[PDB]
């Protein structure tokens, strides 16, 4: 566990929006995903619309400028870079997935919670109950909650 952000106020910017979803729903999903982590750390997240943010949120398909191409529908859903300058922190979502607010397709909020974990410096957990487990699993709004392992992991980096 190398890089962590050495400041409490972190910015994000949505570079572009998936056509799979309502704009407001993309905004809300991402916002709620950041809140999951601010809930258990001293971190504060603010959305900006211009300039350089710490965490750029991108929807893209195939080769998209960073040596780690996406693979079409299925397989890899998203990836994110650990804390650092430039691409550090950034979270990319595979546009070849079909992003949703619900159980259909791939759930943006759940995926974003996982990716933002990486953006903050977390790796993968071996606990199949943890949001940082390496394989996506759909959990509804009644069931999602950060596992104790996720909480232990993030507080070992920030609190
Ligand atoms: Ca960045
Ligand atoms: Ca994919
Ligand atoms: Ca799509
Ligand atoms: Zn990428
Ligand atoms: Zn991951």
mmCIF file of C-alpha atoms and ligand atoms in Angstrom:
data_model
loop_
_atom_site.group_PDB
_atom_site.id
_atom_site.type_symbol
_atom_site.label_atom_id
_atom_site.label_comp_id
_atom_site.label_asym_id
_atom_site.label_seq_id
_atom_site.Cartn_x
_atom_site.Cartn_y
_atom_site.Cartn_z
ATOM 1 C CA UNK A 1 0.000 0.000 0.000
ATOM 2 C CA UNK A 2 2.153 2.779 -1.383
ATOM 3 C CA UNK A 3 0.428 5.978 -2.486
ATOM 4 C CA UNK A 4 -2.291 7.730 -0.527
ATOM 5 C CA UNK A 5 -3.627 11.263 -0.849
ATOM 6 C CA UNK A 6 -1.836 13.541 1.593
ATOM 7 C CA UNK A 7 -4.697 16.030 1.823
ATOM 8 C CA UNK A 8 -8.307 15.877 3.006
ATOM 9 C CA UNK A 9 -10.088 17.844 0.261
ATOM 10 C CA UNK A 10 -10.206 15.806 -2.956
ATOM 11 C CA UNK A 11 -11.801 16.879 -6.217
ATOM 12 C CA UNK A 12 -13.416 14.881 -8.992
ATOM 13 C CA UNK A 13 -14.632 15.725 -12.464
ATOM 14 C CA UNK A 14 -16.902 13.730 -14.772
ATOM 15 C CA UNK A 15 -15.045 13.912 -18.091
ATOM 16 C CA UNK A 16 -17.942 12.540 -20.117
ATOM 17 C CA UNK A 17 -21.244 10.783 -19.564
ATOM 18 C CA UNK A 18 -22.338 7.325 -20.599
ATOM 19 C CA UNK A 19 -25.372 7.418 -22.925
ATOM 20 C CA UNK A 20 -26.657 4.374 -21.047
ATOM 21 C CA UNK A 21 -28.104 6.470 -18.229
ATOM 22 C CA UNK A 22 -29.815 9.727 -17.379
ATOM 23 C CA UNK A 23 -27.221 12.455 -16.705
ATOM 24 C CA UNK A 24 -28.636 13.145 -13.259
ATOM 25 C CA UNK A 25 -28.381 9.449 -12.441
ATOM 26 C CA UNK A 26 -24.697 9.332 -13.381
ATOM 27 C CA UNK A 27 -24.076 12.377 -11.196
ATOM 28 C CA UNK A 28 -25.974 10.797 -8.297
ATOM 29 C CA UNK A 29 -24.355 7.360 -8.582
ATOM 30 C CA UNK A 30 -20.857 8.857 -8.562
ATOM 31 C CA UNK A 31 -21.719 11.274 -5.772
ATOM 32 C CA UNK A 32 -23.142 8.456 -3.606
ATOM 33 C CA UNK A 33 -20.085 6.290 -4.304
ATOM 34 C CA UNK A 34 -17.743 8.998 -3.009
ATOM 35 C CA UNK A 35 -20.004 9.366 0.045
ATOM 36 C CA UNK A 36 -19.479 5.697 0.908
ATOM 37 C CA UNK A 37 -15.787 6.463 1.505
ATOM 38 C CA UNK A 38 -16.132 9.924 3.041
ATOM 39 C CA UNK A 39 -18.439 8.215 5.557
ATOM 40 C CA UNK A 40 -15.533 6.307 7.078
ATOM 41 C CA UNK A 41 -12.585 8.674 6.524
ATOM 42 C CA UNK A 42 -11.639 12.338 7.030
ATOM 43 C CA UNK A 43 -11.887 12.804 3.261
ATOM 44 C CA UNK A 44 -14.153 15.324 1.547
ATOM 45 C CA UNK A 45 -15.058 15.100 -2.132
ATOM 46 C CA UNK A 46 -16.145 17.947 -4.366
ATOM 47 C CA UNK A 47 -17.323 17.825 -7.958
ATOM 48 C CA UNK A 48 -15.751 20.406 -10.260
ATOM 49 C CA UNK A 49 -16.761 21.224 -13.816
ATOM 50 C CA UNK A 50 -13.594 22.932 -15.085
ATOM 51 C CA UNK A 51 -9.862 22.697 -14.479
ATOM 52 C CA UNK A 52 -7.790 19.781 -13.206
ATOM 53 C CA UNK A 53 -9.467 17.465 -10.671
ATOM 54 C CA UNK A 54 -7.629 14.854 -8.597
ATOM 55 C CA UNK A 55 -9.945 12.114 -9.823
ATOM 56 C CA UNK A 56 -11.104 12.213 -13.406
ATOM 57 C CA UNK A 57 -14.086 9.929 -14.121
ATOM 58 C CA UNK A 58 -14.091 8.679 -17.716
ATOM 59 C CA UNK A 59 -16.349 6.446 -19.820
ATOM 60 C CA UNK A 60 -14.436 4.849 -22.699
ATOM 61 C CA UNK A 61 -14.145 1.700 -24.774
ATOM 62 C CA UNK A 62 -11.255 -0.323 -26.187
ATOM 63 C CA UNK A 63 -7.925 1.494 -26.334
ATOM 64 C CA UNK A 64 -8.439 4.853 -24.653
ATOM 65 C CA UNK A 65 -5.068 6.472 -24.131
ATOM 66 C CA UNK A 66 -3.536 4.686 -21.121
ATOM 67 C CA UNK A 67 -1.896 1.282 -22.054
ATOM 68 C CA UNK A 68 -4.773 -0.677 -20.463
ATOM 69 C CA UNK A 69 -7.357 -1.271 -23.147
ATOM 70 C CA UNK A 70 -10.875 -2.406 -22.391
ATOM 71 C CA UNK A 71 -12.209 -5.638 -23.817
ATOM 72 C CA UNK A 72 -15.743 -5.080 -25.082
ATOM 73 C CA UNK A 73 -18.891 -6.184 -23.292
ATOM 74 C CA UNK A 74 -18.239 -8.330 -20.220
ATOM 75 C CA UNK A 75 -14.858 -9.244 -18.776
ATOM 76 C CA UNK A 76 -13.300 -6.135 -17.255
ATOM 77 C CA UNK A 77 -15.893 -3.515 -16.248
ATOM 78 C CA UNK A 78 -13.680 -0.657 -15.088
ATOM 79 C CA UNK A 79 -10.265 0.202 -13.716
ATOM 80 C CA UNK A 80 -8.698 2.959 -11.635
ATOM 81 C CA UNK A 81 -5.270 4.288 -10.780
ATOM 82 C CA UNK A 82 -3.931 4.790 -7.262
ATOM 83 C CA UNK A 83 -3.183 8.232 -5.815
ATOM 84 C CA UNK A 84 -0.675 10.358 -7.726
ATOM 85 C CA UNK A 85 -0.440 13.233 -10.191
ATOM 86 C CA UNK A 86 -1.886 13.182 -13.701
ATOM 87 C CA UNK A 87 -3.630 9.876 -14.377
ATOM 88 C CA UNK A 88 -3.153 8.971 -10.711
ATOM 89 C CA UNK A 89 -6.538 8.666 -9.019
ATOM 90 C CA UNK A 90 -8.484 8.470 -12.272
ATOM 91 C CA UNK A 91 -11.336 5.995 -12.697
ATOM 92 C CA UNK A 92 -12.297 4.618 -16.116
ATOM 93 C CA UNK A 93 -15.522 2.753 -16.856
ATOM 94 C CA UNK A 94 -15.877 0.475 -19.900
ATOM 95 C CA UNK A 95 -18.505 2.019 -22.201
ATOM 96 C CA UNK A 96 -19.087 -1.397 -23.781
ATOM 97 C CA UNK A 97 -20.889 -2.320 -20.572
ATOM 98 C CA UNK A 98 -24.484 -1.219 -20.126
ATOM 99 C CA UNK A 99 -24.494 0.983 -17.026
ATOM 100 C CA UNK A 100 -27.626 1.241 -14.858
ATOM 101 C CA UNK A 101 -29.104 2.395 -11.549
ATOM 102 C CA UNK A 102 -30.556 -1.058 -10.863
ATOM 103 C CA UNK A 103 -29.980 -4.828 -11.116
ATOM 104 C CA UNK A 104 -30.051 -4.858 -14.905
ATOM 105 C CA UNK A 105 -26.822 -4.445 -16.837
ATOM 106 C CA UNK A 106 -23.871 -3.348 -14.717
ATOM 107 C CA UNK A 107 -24.615 -1.155 -11.705
ATOM 108 C CA UNK A 108 -22.667 2.110 -11.899
ATOM 109 C CA UNK A 109 -22.850 2.968 -8.188
ATOM 110 C CA UNK A 110 -21.506 -0.400 -7.044
ATOM 111 C CA UNK A 111 -18.729 -0.407 -9.612
ATOM 112 C CA UNK A 112 -17.805 3.166 -8.718
ATOM 113 C CA UNK A 113 -17.555 2.357 -5.004
ATOM 114 C CA UNK A 114 -15.011 -0.322 -5.924
ATOM 115 C CA UNK A 115 -13.064 1.879 -8.354
ATOM 116 C CA UNK A 116 -12.932 4.835 -5.991
ATOM 117 C CA UNK A 117 -11.482 2.430 -3.405
ATOM 118 C CA UNK A 118 -8.584 1.980 -5.847
ATOM 119 C CA UNK A 119 -8.456 5.754 -6.475
ATOM 120 C CA UNK A 120 -7.869 6.180 -2.731
ATOM 121 C CA UNK A 121 -5.144 3.539 -2.652
ATOM 122 C CA UNK A 122 -6.878 0.241 -1.823
ATOM 123 C CA UNK A 123 -5.988 -3.026 -3.507
ATOM 124 C CA UNK A 124 -8.173 -6.125 -3.640
ATOM 125 C CA UNK A 125 -9.590 -8.038 -0.696
ATOM 126 C CA UNK A 126 -9.831 -11.819 -0.466
ATOM 127 C CA UNK A 127 -13.141 -11.472 1.416
ATOM 128 C CA UNK A 128 -16.072 -12.262 -0.892
ATOM 129 C CA UNK A 129 -18.218 -9.883 1.222
ATOM 130 C CA UNK A 130 -15.944 -6.895 0.655
ATOM 131 C CA UNK A 131 -16.625 -4.272 -2.009
ATOM 132 C CA UNK A 132 -12.915 -4.569 -2.867
ATOM 133 C CA UNK A 133 -13.229 -8.286 -3.751
ATOM 134 C CA UNK A 134 -11.788 -8.750 -7.264
ATOM 135 C CA UNK A 135 -15.017 -9.909 -8.959
ATOM 136 C CA UNK A 136 -18.192 -7.837 -9.405
ATOM 137 C CA UNK A 137 -21.330 -9.059 -7.620
ATOM 138 C CA UNK A 138 -24.700 -7.288 -7.689
ATOM 139 C CA UNK A 139 -26.082 -6.306 -4.230
ATOM 140 C CA UNK A 140 -29.282 -4.189 -4.077
ATOM 141 C CA UNK A 141 -29.814 -0.978 -2.127
ATOM 142 C CA UNK A 142 -31.234 -2.871 0.873
ATOM 143 C CA UNK A 143 -28.095 -5.108 1.085
ATOM 144 C CA UNK A 144 -25.113 -2.909 0.118
ATOM 145 C CA UNK A 145 -22.990 -1.694 3.032
ATOM 146 C CA UNK A 146 -19.198 -1.458 3.430
ATOM 147 C CA UNK A 147 -17.836 -4.634 4.998
ATOM 148 C CA UNK A 148 -15.678 -4.480 8.118
ATOM 149 C CA UNK A 149 -12.707 -5.497 5.955
ATOM 150 C CA UNK A 150 -13.261 -2.559 3.582
ATOM 151 C CA UNK A 151 -13.494 -0.263 6.608
ATOM 152 C CA UNK A 152 -10.321 -1.716 8.140
ATOM 153 C CA UNK A 153 -8.518 -1.293 4.822
ATOM 154 C CA UNK A 154 -9.471 2.316 4.232
ATOM 155 C CA UNK A 155 -8.894 3.415 7.825
ATOM 156 C CA UNK A 156 -5.420 1.834 7.700
ATOM 157 C CA UNK A 157 -4.715 4.377 4.903
ATOM 158 C CA UNK A 158 -6.572 7.472 6.221
ATOM 159 C CA UNK A 159 -7.987 7.489 9.737
HETATM 160 CA CA1 LIG B 1 -5.747 12.376 -11.490
HETATM 161 CA CA1 LIG B 2 -15.557 -5.038 -20.635
HETATM 162 CA CA1 LIG B 3 -22.560 1.506 -22.669
HETATM 163 ZN ZN1 LIG B 4 -8.167 3.374 -18.647
HETATM 164 ZN ZN1 LIG B 5 -10.560 -3.705 -8.673
#
